[PDB]
């Protein structure tokens, strides 16, 4: 009957299974989950500054369509487009639509710097029944519809603006594509318009095209929206003999620096989370996640797996 | 494990060990009792916590990205915008799968090492006064009261004390 001293290790009744290099199912005492699979279902307004267009997409907000009155001068870290956003104004298309909405979303600002232009020899502030603001004919709040002098000519526009500031100016303008040769002559008196916006280093010129388009808001015509950037020291020139949709100023090109747009339908709650997704916010300390590939902020890295168990204990052998 | 102590010559674990990860379990004249071992338990936890902290450092923070969902076919550009994201997700998924499997293989080997570490420490303590039964227990060839047992567990056991009794009981 000699004394014996034994050496061992702890164990538990129900252990956790983990993967290793040499086995798919090894039971260990304790393990932590590294893949986050849950979300709040609401977008947390902290610490990221959010902006809800909530009836207006970003571009409609930049142009100033009826619904987007609340978006003026807004600043954001994340703009939020909704699926319920609706066009409300004269029908328009935007060549390279995703590029101009990704410039407005990076800049993270709808601050419109208003400027006074002198469109010599044209009627101004035209409105359309397809763009109603309070049951009344309106237009884009940041665009000026120019038509011929009342019973007169479309005096040739040669307006210029020099960028004196230290920032890059983003000008939003457009070109009206009439529906019939009557409308063209009824509005600008030329048989064929022309819009040429230019800087010293880049230019763009458009001659409109008459024809029938599907009726949108009882309108068969269209407005093609364009944009021109102006660097400090450069000058922009709006030259047109017809069909010009003039600007009312410019936007300020800001720095990306957590500025983007997220297309979601979830309500903005009162929570706090440094990570947003299209499916809501993520609150976790885990490295990975299977919530959504769309992730904005300090987020876990999106993976395909739904569970990756890291072993935090020895081999469990009861 | 690479050392074959846990799930090896140590048959199974002790569920009565709730105050530590590694422990002693003796049988002397006065009776029987179990005590955890702090040093071995702490060394294992430090290396698990150490690799846990390494895996949490929040380094991923992007805001402006490329679109990852599309409401109309476009062709060349959309194909690329998709293929770029798919390529990234696959690579990160591999980076995660390999990380977990590798860290676990190391984790299990670390805990199997610390168990053998403790055993080898006690082996060197007695060092002619006991013998390795094989199951992780030492047959102490001398009377070892509770004060003697504690001396083995807090590292003050002087083998020269019992060397004369122990060798005699072993050889004959």
């Amino acid at each position, epitope marked *: 009957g000699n004394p014996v001293i034994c050496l061992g290790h702890h164990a538990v009744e129900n252990g956790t299974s983990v993967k290793t290099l040499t086995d798919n199912h090894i039971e260990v005492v*304790s393990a932590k989950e590294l893949v986050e699979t849950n979300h709040i279902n609401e977008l947390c307004p902290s610490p990221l500054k959010l902006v809800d267009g909530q009836d207006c997409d970003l571009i409609n907000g930049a142009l100033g369509s009826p619904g987007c009155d609340h978006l003026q001068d807004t600043t954001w870290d994340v703009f939020i487009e909704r699926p319920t956003a609706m066009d409300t104004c004269y029908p328009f298309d935007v060549p390279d639509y995703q590029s101009l909405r990704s410039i407005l979303a990076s800049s993270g600002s709808l601050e419109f710097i208003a400027e006074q232009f002198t469109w010599n020899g044209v009627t101004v502030d035209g409105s359309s029944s397809a763009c109603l603001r309070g049951g009344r004919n309106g237009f884009f709040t940041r665009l000026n519809w120019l038509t011929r002098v009342k019973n007169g000519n479309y005096g040739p526009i040669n307006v210029t603006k020099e960028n004196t500031g230290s920032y890059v100016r983003l000008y939003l303008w457009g070109v009206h594509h009439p529906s019939s040769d009557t409308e063209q002559t009824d509005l600008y008196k030329v048989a064929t318009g022309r819009v040429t916006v230019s800087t010293r280093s880049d230019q763009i010129s458009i001659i409109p095209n008459i024809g029938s388009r599907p009726r949108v808001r009882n309108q068969s015509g269209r407005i093609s929206i364009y944009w021109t950037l102006v660097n400090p020291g450069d000058s922009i020139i709006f030259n047109s003999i017809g069909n010009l949709i003039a600007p009312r100023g410019h936007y300020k090109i800001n720095k990306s620096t957590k500025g983007t747009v997220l297309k979601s339908d979830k309500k903005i709650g009162s929570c706090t989370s440094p990570c947003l997704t299209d499916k809501g916010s993520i609150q976790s300390d885990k490295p990975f996640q299977n919530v959504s590939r769309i992730a904005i902020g300090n987020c876990p890295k999106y993976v395909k797996q739904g569970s990756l168990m890291l072993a935090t204990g020895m081999r469990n052998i009861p | 494990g690479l050392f074959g102590a846990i799930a090896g010559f140590i048959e199974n674990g002790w569920q009565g060990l709730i105050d530590g990860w590694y422990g002693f379990r003796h049988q002397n004249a006065e009776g029987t009792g179990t005590a955890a071992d*702090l040093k071995s338990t702490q060394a294992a936890i*430090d290396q698990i916590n150490g690799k846990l*902290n390494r895996l949490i450092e929040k380094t991923n923070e992007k805001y402006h990205q490329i679109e990852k969902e599309f409401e109309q076919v476009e062709g060349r550009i959309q194909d690329l915008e998709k293929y770029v994201e798919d390529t990234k997700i696959d690579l990160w998924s591999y980076n995660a799968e390999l990380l977990v499997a590798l860290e676990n293989q190391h984790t299990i080997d670390v805990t199997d090492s610390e168990m053998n570490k403790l055993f080898e420490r006690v082996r060197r303590q007695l060092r002619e006064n006991a013998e390795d039964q094989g199951n992780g227990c030492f047959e102490i060839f001398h009377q070892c009261d509770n004060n003697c047992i504690e001396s083995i567990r807090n590292g003050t056991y002087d083998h020269n004390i019992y060397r004369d009794e122990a060798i005699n009981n072993r050889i004959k």
Partner: antibody, heavy 124, light 107 residues
Framework: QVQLVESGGGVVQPGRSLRLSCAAS????????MHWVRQAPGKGLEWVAG????????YYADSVKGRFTISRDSSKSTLYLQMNSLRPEDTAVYYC??????????????????WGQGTTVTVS | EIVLTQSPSSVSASVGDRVTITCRAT??????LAWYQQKPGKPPKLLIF???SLQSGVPSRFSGSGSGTDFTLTISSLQPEDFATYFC?????????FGGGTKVEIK
């Protein structure tokens, strides 16, 4: 829900004895080791005593070794701090504290999760 | 023993300042440090265990750092209720050591 209640603190003369008690509630007391930590009034926290889960291994501070005696009871789930040979150095606000459980083990040597309200011991 | 040394011993700051505190010991106490909050007349509350692991329910502004030799308790955006005295704890081996206290006053 889970908390620790202290008691026993009174006014006592040097050289005599007292017994302070710490009743647990809302957790498996007999599974955790436990600690007594005293905040000398004016100074910071000063660990004084600690005991294992079973009660066979007891750890004391060098200032109270052979003078104070810790003990516990599974049947009442209570922690006893039997103080003998008191002196004004031992004047302090006594706290019974619970070392944190880590991973799966209820270690005795860790940070302290739960504290009692604080029962003051005055020695004139 | 192991001797802890909190620096500074006291500090005054306004709400919203980047507060930094240090715990400083002798031995290799690996990663065993526990920071505590303490209001006057009240028992401590565990803020950080493992010297970096945030305690459950504690706001994310409290953060801990350090390993082995040099330790640090950082607070990003101080709040009115965060006015308190702070203690660090050694937990590598017995006996348990605490610090001299680092109180945050009003500026």
């Amino acid at each position: 829900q889970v908390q620790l209640v202290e008691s026993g603190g009174g006014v006592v003369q040097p050289g005599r004895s007292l017994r302070l008690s710490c009743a647990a509630s809302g957790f498996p007391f007999s599974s955790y080791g436990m600690h007594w930590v005293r905040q000398a009034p004016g100074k910071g926290l000063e660990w004084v005593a600690g005991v294992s889960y079973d009660g066979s291994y007891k750890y004391y501070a060098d200032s109270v070794k052979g003078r104070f005696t810790i003990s516990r009871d599974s049947s009442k789930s209570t922690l006893y701090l039997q103080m003998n040979s008191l002196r004004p150095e031992d004047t302090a606000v006594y706290y019974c504290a619970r070392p944190s459980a880590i991973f799966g083990i209820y270690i005795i040597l860790n940070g302290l999760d739960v504290w009692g309200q604080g029962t003051t011991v005055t020695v004139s | 023993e192991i001797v802890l040394t909190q620096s500074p011993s006291s500090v005054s700051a306004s709400v919203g300042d980047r507060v930094t505190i240090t715990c400083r010991a002798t031995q290799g106490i690996s990663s065993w440090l526990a920071w505590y909050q303490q209001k006057p007349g009240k028992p401590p509350k565990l803020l950080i265990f493992g010297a970096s692991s945030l305690q459950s329910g504690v706001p994310s502004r409290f953060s801990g750092s350090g390993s082995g030799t040099d330790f640090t308790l950082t607070i990003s955006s101080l709040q009115p209720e965060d006015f308190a005295t702070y203690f660090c704890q050694q937990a590598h081996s017995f006996p348990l050591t605490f610090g001299g206290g680092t109180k945050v006053e009003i500026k």
